[PDB]
Design an enzyme around this catalytic site. Structure first.
Site, short mmCIF file in Angstrom:
data_model
loop_
_atom_site.label_atom_id
_atom_site.label_comp_id
_atom_site.label_asym_id
_atom_site.label_seq_id
_atom_site.Cartn_x
_atom_site.Cartn_y
_atom_site.Cartn_z
CD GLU A 45 -1.53 2.43 1.66
OE1 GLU A 45 -0.61 2.47 2.50
OE2 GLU A 45 -2.08 3.44 1.19
N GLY B 122 -1.24 -8.66 7.80
CA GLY B 122 -0.94 -9.66 6.79
C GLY B 122 0.18 -9.24 5.86
CD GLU C 287 31.49 -16.40 16.05
OE1 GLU C 287 31.22 -17.12 17.03
OE2 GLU C 287 31.73 -16.86 14.91
CG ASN D 188 9.66 3.44 15.08
OD1 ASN D 188 9.12 2.39 15.42
ND2 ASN D 188 9.60 3.91 13.84
CB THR E 36 -3.75 -2.47 16.59
OG1 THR E 36 -3.36 -3.32 15.51
CG2 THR E 36 -2.56 -2.23 17.49
CG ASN F 289 3.91 -3.61 19.63
OD1 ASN F 289 4.97 -3.21 19.14
ND2 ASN F 289 2.94 -4.14 18.91
N1 LIG Z 1 6.08 -1.12 17.75
C1 LIG Z 1 5.46 -0.75 16.63
N2 LIG Z 1 4.50 -1.57 16.08
C2 LIG Z 1 3.86 -1.20 14.95
C3 LIG Z 1 4.17 -0.01 14.33
N3 LIG Z 1 3.40 0.10 13.23
C4 LIG Z 1 2.61 -0.99 13.14
N4 LIG Z 1 2.88 -1.80 14.20
C5 LIG Z 1 2.24 -3.10 14.48
O1 LIG Z 1 1.58 -3.55 13.32
C6 LIG Z 1 0.31 -4.08 13.64
C7 LIG Z 1 -0.68 -3.83 12.51
O2 LIG Z 1 -0.07 -4.03 11.25
P1 LIG Z 1 0.80 -2.86 10.60
O3 LIG Z 1 2.27 -3.10 10.86
O4 LIG Z 1 0.38 -1.53 11.17
O5 LIG Z 1 0.51 -2.91 9.03
P2 LIG Z 1 0.95 -4.21 8.20
O6 LIG Z 1 1.55 -5.25 9.11
O7 LIG Z 1 1.91 -3.80 7.11
O8 LIG Z 1 -0.41 -4.72 7.53
P3 LIG Z 1 -1.13 -3.74 6.49
O9 LIG Z 1 -1.65 -2.55 7.25
O10 LIG Z 1 -2.28 -4.45 5.81
O11 LIG Z 1 -0.13 -3.28 5.47
C8 LIG Z 1 -0.10 -3.39 14.92
O12 LIG Z 1 -0.75 -4.30 15.79
C9 LIG Z 1 1.19 -2.92 15.55
O13 LIG Z 1 1.49 -3.71 16.67
C10 LIG Z 1 5.14 0.81 14.86
O14 LIG Z 1 5.42 1.88 14.32
N5 LIG Z 1 5.78 0.44 16.02
MG LIG Z 2 -1.16 -1.73 5.56
#
Ligand SMILES: Nc1nc2c(ncn2[C@@H]2O[C@H](COP(=O)(O)OP(=O)(O)OP(=O)(O)O)[C@@H](O)[C@H]2O)c(=O)[nH]1
Ligand SMILES: [Mg+2]
Ligand SMILES: Nc1nc2c(ncn2[C@@H]2O[C@H](COP(=O)(O)OP(=O)(O)O)[C@@H](O)[C@H]2O)c(=O)[nH]1
Ligand SMILES: Nc1nc2c(ncn2[C@@H]2O[C@H](COP(=O)(O)OP(=O)(O)O)[C@@H](O)[C@H]2O)c(=O)[nH]1
Lengths: 430, 50, 439, 200, 152, 71, 430
Positions: C71, C144, C254, C228, C179, C206
């Site tokens: 996306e 996903g 190592e 981050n 989330t 997280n």
């Molecule tokens: N620690 C941390 N976790 C993140 C962050 N962004 C997304 N996540 C984790 O990602 C999960 C949801 O999926 P995303 O990473 O946001 O998006 P994606 O995995 O690429 O899936 P799509 O949205 O369909 O592209 C959330 O439950 C978060 O725990 C981030 O900036 N920091």
């Molecule tokens: Mg996405």
């Protein structure tokens, strides 16, 4: 990129688009004349979601307006923002449905489908990557309920993959507007449940109750009422158009809201909405936003959400806010009412954050959740249906246009089956 | 020193006033169609060419 | 002649990937534009940037990074912001349709049209590198998109290249702070992807980050941006031993030759310290004695897994700062004596101690306080059964009524895949607690 | 604390007890007049006004710490012209006693001995010689840089335009050392110990 | 000596304060500024974008509508976003759709018809004067922006 | 990677420095600056304290400016 | 932290609340407009004990005013300090109480109590750590003691832990304020004993007695009498708001005054109160404070305390004063009147210290004691009630809304049972 074309049918459909376009043009700074006046860079980044392009620098909304009586579409050309639409695209008949479903569905409205689909065929092909069709109409109007429903059936079979959206307004029990409302309303959903991927019912009864109890507005008008939906409707797609923390398209919301194939009805609402006498005693903080966003009195459907148990829901937070307090409040919301969140699906709240807030406010929330309480609307309509049918009153008008009472029985049988099947899970246990 | 210029709130330092010219009450609360509705005083702008 | 390439997939990786480069960006003397500042004109020395950059023959250094996503919204932000000129303009592969949390979608239908470009792009960089030490993959399993392509990418990366090591910084969903609603379904399927494909995987859940931020940094309104910054540091110390002097150095190779007792069990928890806000950070002594202890402190385990509920297998700890070898000996011995932190019966020596010299650097406008003594540990403990068990139970309740099972079957994923996937998760347990029994 | 009534007095009344007390315990080089001169470096305009932050730290530098409640307590009654800024002139107007006549006579009698010409102004050198002579016995009557070398014993005071030590100031600079010392005898003893002149 | 007074500091109510006026947007000066990037290097809204590399996707305003002649994707985008237009208020109609009653929406491409001919010329979208063959623009020796100038 | 620095504080000496070192009569390990170096770093740590705090405080006021400005 | 929400009902509930919100406004130096003009930090660092927050730094008292008729609601708003309460907090009907409990517990109050429970529910969740509730209402009023009682029953079952406090004003037959008082008052007590954690009763007669004897003023108005009660409320909750030598929250007062759960009634009072012709040469020291405090005639309950034996009592002194002289005096009292203190609870007096005196004075104290003397207040009501029931005169009004004859018989025993059980410990010996 991944934009969506708009098709709206019926007078109620035309009016909703009458203001939904006025607001959306406001968000991107597209003046009614059609020239650009935006301020930041965002107002021109992803505008392809709803707007196309043509020579002359002016922007053409890619809407399709379909009414079976010329009065409505003629009116839309007179008021503000009544010039952005493509005059070429309008398709209009000559007679009028006369708030009869069949007349605008089986004989005439079908006869008009020859051209209306042709324009749609051209429109969808034009976009690079079509993302869905969001359809708005009224179930209380024979043509709108029929032409809108007839249009959906043809469209779905043509695009088996592209998503499909529907905004349906069902008549409430107390404030009724049509005497034949029970028939058309009950026999049209049957056409919607099978083909409509998504639905978000809106109850005219709810609006007035919210108007007097929420807005404290002395003299509401249908101009105002169309606004509440217009803003909320933008909520479902708003995060799709602008950069944000966790992008959430229309597909993803469908991904996390419908448990099984046959339950695709949602109830939504908008907040914060503060009346003018009290905006200066409240406090705008994230916890304050949610306490009004899951409460009953702010929902758009007259069915009380506390008479049943939620299955799953998603909240699309709008504006600049940080999540940590968001997660705590949400987990606080779900874990404080265990009786109102089914116990076999843990972590039953969805979250989405987008940065641009509506012009003039910083934070707000748009809700979309399929709640078992919705059976009250379908149940109440079904009952009133049984009252009229037992005496075969008002039957001859419908029976004179092909369809007979045999289909009524089939629709009622399917209508009851969905009603019962909906409640099977409510009492289900692990 | 710093002497106060008026008596502060206390058990008997108000015991004004009850002997005034006229006592009239304006209904700020009215109930219609099962919804609360009240008056709109104290929020009134005056006018402008805006 | 020692370099490592980074592979990022998923929005969670992109954001974490975006931040991780600035820490490197400000650490090698490279301004955003991509060349050394004009103020310093002394020719050129160093050469330390060669580990994470390639010489273009003129001026700017091009990061050896690859970004993927389905996306374009998140990717569009980087290419329009102030970091526009740095990344290679054509290796930021972008999609046109999103997965929408359908692990099947990115693994059977759409990812096939993008798996080709990524493999072609990566193979080209490997040619340029001469002493490629290993890969790094960052992703989130709650969506996903990351789970799908990331799963596909690793499967291909373990066949073509053979004996090159791989590191995996995955992100499983938090215990109860979630989330999404469908993460448990695709979370398990992801487990089989890296169960037998990735040499080393790092638990970085997280909810712990929030806990660390609130109690230490003293912030009541944190956001993803500050989340981050902590993670990027963890990458900083692990690879910090490859581009600076040291009297006792440890290469990326190592870690998985010492921290993985058996081929199956190769998940090790990651913890970081110290984390003390500038408002009080330097208003305690900050001696080496206290820093190590907080490394094993239960509360600062950056992963929400209770370590006292299992034995410690083997720990390799990285020290960066101003440590004198006597400092490490004096502190390390004490931990062993402790009766609150125990070691497995058949692992007498379980510490791999490394020393590094370059001090940690503080980004402008940050929360971490620039100190002169810090510690990074990547330890594997049997306690990890807690996280796996919880993800096991959540799966059982929903699948019982065949809720949501339709979409992952109607996208082209055979319904049978679930039957085999669940067993491995159960199978993974029985060996996790079998090795924990004393002889 | 609940400064509605005489509370401004009570809080001010007590706080002056603590501050004057602290200097007495120190009794040494720490002198009230140092604070008088200190604030000039913070004024930046010689208007006598300093913000909340500047005033607090400056008092912190000297070595006197108070409760948070008091600092606003000090602010209110010394914010005479409602600016939000305390006036150090008035604050320095307090913590400066009038002086008991036992000291004044001891002050003036000593002044009488110093000014043998009854002119009323003191040349800096003459005071310098007596102070140093009382400390050494073989210090010799002559040297090379008597003026500059022995002058640094003095100039902690200030002279008038003519350059002599005026009657008004000289009395002033002995009372200001009356806040760090709280014993009447020992204040007297300082004079003859530093002067070798004792009459009372 | 007097009764008890309510108002301290004599704070006059906002009711009687002078007038509403143009300070509404005192907050929306930094309201349209993303935080996905941003807060990493800057704090005010990202400045207008002047250059884009291949792969930018979303709607550079000038590309699709008017077919531009062939050129490098970097060069073509530069001309459209670096020129005037895409701005300025030709008619002064506000976004809120209130200046609408001020305007008329009149087009100067009309005349009359019937009793002979009814076609009428076309609207102001029409090229003229610039009529010049292809080889005229493309080919010239040095009178262009030097391809590798980049002042230092 | 390599190993150039024996300790974080001192580098390997120039050849003229080690006149002896043939027998264990010099060891350079006692620091002989341990009092000095600790004293130096003390005040140095203070500056970073002061800088961050004052910077941190300022961002607060701007943060108060935003929300209040909203008011 | 540990904030409490004030919910009042009834004209006495409103008026009493009206002044009480005014007095607390002045102690923190809050002007009517709601902006802050305080002087020292002592008036803000714990100000969250009673107040929420909002944009613009404007404080809104977390009040919930409930009544069944508009007349009392209308009056308080129009006065000064009436702009603090926000609109949505109010809740009212359109029928009227009619001095009838039956109208207050079964038919009318029920149809409106749903909302108030909805409005009250918002405050508890919003605040960080609820410390408890306080209730102000009159037993001599129909809805006052009637509807407010329903809120008590519903609230109790919704939070098993939170503390409950109630200021009560029983009607003494001497000032026969309502001929229908006897039935409601006897009916009211039955609910109050089983649910309310603490109960504080005040007799109107004393207030008139207090006004004429101690204050020695000419023409009291219901404003003045409402004034004395208001400050008394400040005494109990005072300690939690300001720093001091010894902390004493609300729960501590209960923990050391209610020997058994069945005996939780107290008698309160205020001191000093001196007439303008009597203040000229009255001393100002601890000895004068305690001298008036334990006085028989100053207490605000008609039943003269000295006819019985003191079970337990606590003293909440305010303002600076040496801890010694408060301790020594309390020892002095427990010896010079030996016969007036129970035997099997030695050292049965509580004392506390607070560092801020109410504006204008130097030393003050609020007294709270559970004395067996309260048996007079029930006995006079108890004997009164039995007299007019054997003829079931006025019985038809209550029996007009579903109430059954058994209820009245039941209420007689419990209130009769308490009277017998209250005086048994008086004659008990060790
Ligand atoms: N620690 C941390 N976790 C993140 C962050 N962004 C997304 N996540 C984790 O990602 C999960 C949801 O999926 P995303 O990473 O946001 O998006 P994606 O995995 O690429 O899936 P799509 O949205 O369909 O592209 C959330 O439950 C978060 O725990 C981030 O900036 N920091
Ligand atoms: Mg996405
Ligand atoms: N809330 C709302 N409802 C509308 C509006 N316009 C029409 N409706 C609904 O539409 C119903 C009548 O629709 P109708 O005109 O017969 O639809 P048609 O047959 O397709 O033209 C009424 O019951 C209204 O509730 C509107 O502007 N707002
Ligand atoms: N002293 C005093 N008593 C009051 C006041 N307001 C009401 N009351 C008492 O309340 C009783 C009547 O209350 P009522 O109107 O029936 O309450 P309702 O049922 O809520 O309407 C009387 O006996 C009064 O003594 C007041 O301001 N002062």
């Amino acid at each position: 990129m991944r934009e969506i074309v708009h098709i709206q049918g019926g007078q109620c459909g035309n009016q909703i688009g009458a203001k939904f376009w006025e607001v959306i043009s406001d968000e991107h700074g597209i003046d009614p004349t059609g020239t650009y006046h935006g301020d930041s860079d965002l107002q021109l980044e992803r505008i392809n979601v709803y707007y196309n392009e043509a020579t002359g620098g002016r922007y053409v909304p890619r809407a399709i307006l379909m009414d079976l009586e010329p009065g409505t579409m003629d009116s839309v050309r007179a008021g503000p923002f009544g010039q952005l639409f493509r005059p070429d695209n309008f398709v209009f008949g000559q007679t009028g449905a006369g708030n009869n479903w069949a007349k605008g569905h089986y004989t005439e409205g079908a006869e008009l489908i020859d051209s209306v689909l042709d324009v749609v065929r051209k429109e969808a092909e034009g976009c690079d990557c079509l993302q869905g069709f969001q359809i708005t109409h009224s179930l209380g109007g024979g043509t709108g309920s029929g032409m809108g429903t007839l249009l959906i059936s043809k469209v779905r079979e043509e695009y088996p993959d592209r998503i499909m959206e529907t905004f349906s307004v069902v008549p409430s029990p107390k404030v009724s507007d049509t005497v034949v409302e029970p028939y058309n309303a009950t026999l049209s959903v049957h056409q919607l449940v099978e083909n409509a991927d998504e639905c978000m019912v809106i109850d005219n009864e709810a609006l007035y109750d919210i108007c007097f109890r929420t807005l404290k507005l002395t003299t509401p008008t249908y101009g105002d009422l169309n606004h509440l939906v217009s803003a909320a409707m933008s909520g479902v797609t708003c995060c799709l158009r602008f950069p944000g923390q966790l992008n959430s398209d229309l597909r993803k919301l469908a991904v996390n809201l419908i448990p099984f194939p046959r339950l695709h009805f949602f109830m939504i609402g908008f907040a914060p909405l503060t009346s003018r006498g009290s905006q200066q005693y409240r406090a705008l903080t994230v916890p304050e936003l949610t306490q009004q966003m899951f409460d009953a009195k702010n929902m758009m459907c007259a069915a009380d959400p506390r008479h049943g148990r939620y299955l799953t829901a998603s909240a699309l937070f709008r504006g600049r806010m940080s999540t940590k307090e968001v997660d705590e409040q949400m987990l606080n919301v779900q874990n404080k009412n265990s009786s109102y969140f089914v116990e076999w699906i843990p972590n039953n709240i969805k979250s989405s954050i987008c940065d641009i807030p509506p012009k003039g406010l910083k934070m707000a929330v748009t809700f979309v959740g399929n709640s078992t309480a919705i059976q009250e609307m379908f149940k109440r309509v079904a009952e009133q249906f049984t009252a009229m049918f037992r005496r075969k009153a008002f039957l001859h008008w419908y029976t004179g246009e092909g369809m007979d009472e045999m289909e009524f029985t089939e629709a009622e049988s399917n209508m009851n089956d969905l009603v019962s099947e909906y409640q099977q899970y409510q009492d289900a246990t692990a | 020193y710093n002497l106060p210029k008026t008596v502060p709130l206390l058990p008997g330092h108000c015991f004004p006033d009850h002997l005034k010219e006229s006592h009239h009450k304006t209904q700020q609360f009215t109930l219609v169609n099962n919804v609360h509705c009240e008056k709109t005083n104290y929020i009134e702008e005056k006018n402008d060419p805006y | 002649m020692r370099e490592v390439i980074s592979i990022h997939v998923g929005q969670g990786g992109i954001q974490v990937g975006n931040a991780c480069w600035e820490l490197f960006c400000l650490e090698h003397g490279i301004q955003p534009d991509g060349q050394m500042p004009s103020d310093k004109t002394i020719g050129g020395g160093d050469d330390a940037f060669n580990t994470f950059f390639s010489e273009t023959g003129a001026g700017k250094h091009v990061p050896r990074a690859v970004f993927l996503d389905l996306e374009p919204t998140v990717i569009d932000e980087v290419r329009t912001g102030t970091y526009r000129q740095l990344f290679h303009p054509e290796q930021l592969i972008s999609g046109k349709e999103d997965a929408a949390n359908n692990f099947a979608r990115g693994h059977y239908t759409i990812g096939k049209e993008i798996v080709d470009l990524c493999l072609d792009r990566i193979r080209k960089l490997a040619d340029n590198c001469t002493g490629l030490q290993g890969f790094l993959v960052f992703n989130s399993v709650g969506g996903g998109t990351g789970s799908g392509l990331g799963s596909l990418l690793l499967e291909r990366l373990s066949v073509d290249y053979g004996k090159k090591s791989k590191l995996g910084f995955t992100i499983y969903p938090s215990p109860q702070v979630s989330t999404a609603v469908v993460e448990p379904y695709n979370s398990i399927l992801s487990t089989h992807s890296l169960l037998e494909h990735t040499d080393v995987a790092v638990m970085l859940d997280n909810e712990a980050i929030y806990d660390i931020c609130r109690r230490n940094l003293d912030i009541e309104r944190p956001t993803y941006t500050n989340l981050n910054r902590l993670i990027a540091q963890v990458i900083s110390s692990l690879t910090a031993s490859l581009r600076f002097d040291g009297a006792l150095n440890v290469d990326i190779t190592e870690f998985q030759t010492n921290l993985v007792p058996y081929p199956r069990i190769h998940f090790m928890l990651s913890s970081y310290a110290p984390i003390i806000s500038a408002e009080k950070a330097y208003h305690e002594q900050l001696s080496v004695a206290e820093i190590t202890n907080s490394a094993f402190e239960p509360a600062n385990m950056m992963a929400k897994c209770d370590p006292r509920h299992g034995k410690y297998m083997a720990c390799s700890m990285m020290y960066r700062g101003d440590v004198v070898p006597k400092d490490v000996n004096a502190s390390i011995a004490t931990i062993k004596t402790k009766r609150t932190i125990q070691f497995v019966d058949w692992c007498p020596t379980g510490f791999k101690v490394g020393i590094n010299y370059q001090p940690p650097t503080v980004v402008p406008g940050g929360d971490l306080a620039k100190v002169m003594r810090a510690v990074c540990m990547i330890s594997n403990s049997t306690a990890i059964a807690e996280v796996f068990s919880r993800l096991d139970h959540k799966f059982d309740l929903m699948y019982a009524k065949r809720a949501f099972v339709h979409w992952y079957v109607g996208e082209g994923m055979e319904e049978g895949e679930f039957s085999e996937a669940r067993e491995d998760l159960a199978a993974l347990e029985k060996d996790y607690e079998e090795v924990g029994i004393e002889t | 604390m609940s400064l509605y009534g005489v509370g401004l007095n009570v809080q001010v009344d007590r706080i002056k007890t603590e501050f004057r007390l602290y200097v007495s315990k120190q009794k040494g080089g720490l002198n009230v007049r140092n604070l008088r001169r200190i604030f000039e470096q913070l004024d930046y305009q010689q208007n006598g006004q300093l913000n909340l932050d500047d005033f607090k730290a400056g008092l912190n530098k000297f070595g006197f710490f108070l409760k948070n409640v008091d600092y606003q307590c000090l602010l209110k009654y010394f914010d005479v012209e409602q600016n939000g800024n305390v006036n150090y002139l008035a604050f320095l107007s307090c913590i400066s006693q009038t002086l008991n006549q036992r000291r004044a006579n001891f002050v003036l009698k000593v002044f009488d001995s110093i000014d043998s010409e009854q002119k009323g102004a003191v040349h800096p050198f003459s005071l310098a010689e007596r102070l140093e002579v009382v400390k050494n016995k073989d210090y010799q009557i002559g040297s090379k840089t008597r003026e500059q070398l022995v002058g640094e014993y003095v100039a902690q005071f200030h002279k008038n335009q003519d350059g002599l030590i005026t009657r008004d100031e000289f009395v002033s600079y002995y009372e200001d050392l009356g806040l760090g010392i709280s014993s009447d005898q020992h204040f007297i003893e300082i004079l003859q110990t530093q002067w070798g002149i004792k009459e009372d | 000596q007097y009764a008890y007074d309510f108002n301290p500091a004599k704070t006059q109510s906002l009711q009687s304060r002078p007038i509403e006026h143009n300070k509404f947007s005192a907050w929306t000066g930094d309201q349209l500024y993303r935080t996905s990037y941003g807060t990493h290097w800057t704090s005010k809204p990202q400045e207008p974008k002047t250059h884009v590399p291949p792969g930018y996707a979303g709607y550079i305003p000038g590309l699709k509508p008017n077919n531009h002649y062939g050129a490098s994707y970097g060069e073509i985008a530069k001309n459209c976003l670096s020129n005037p237009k895409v701005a300025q208020n030709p008619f002064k109609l506000a976004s809120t759709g209130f200046n609408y009653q001020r305007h008329d929406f009149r087009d100067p491409s009309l005349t009359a018809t019937t009793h002979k001919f009814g076609a009428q010329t076309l609207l102001k979208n029409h090229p003229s004067i610039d009529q010049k063959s292809n080889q005229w623009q493309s080919q010239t020796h040095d009178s262009f922006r030097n391809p590798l100038h980049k002042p230092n | 990677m390599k190993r150039v620095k024996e300790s974080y504080f001192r580098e390997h000496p120039h050849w003229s420095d080690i006149n002896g070192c043939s027998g264990a009569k010099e060891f350079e390990g006692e620091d002989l600056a341990y009092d000095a170096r600790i004293k130096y770093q003390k005040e140095t740590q203070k500056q970073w304290i002061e800088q961050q705090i004052r910077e941190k405080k300022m961002r607060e006021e701007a943060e108060r400016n935003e929300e209040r400005a909203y008011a």
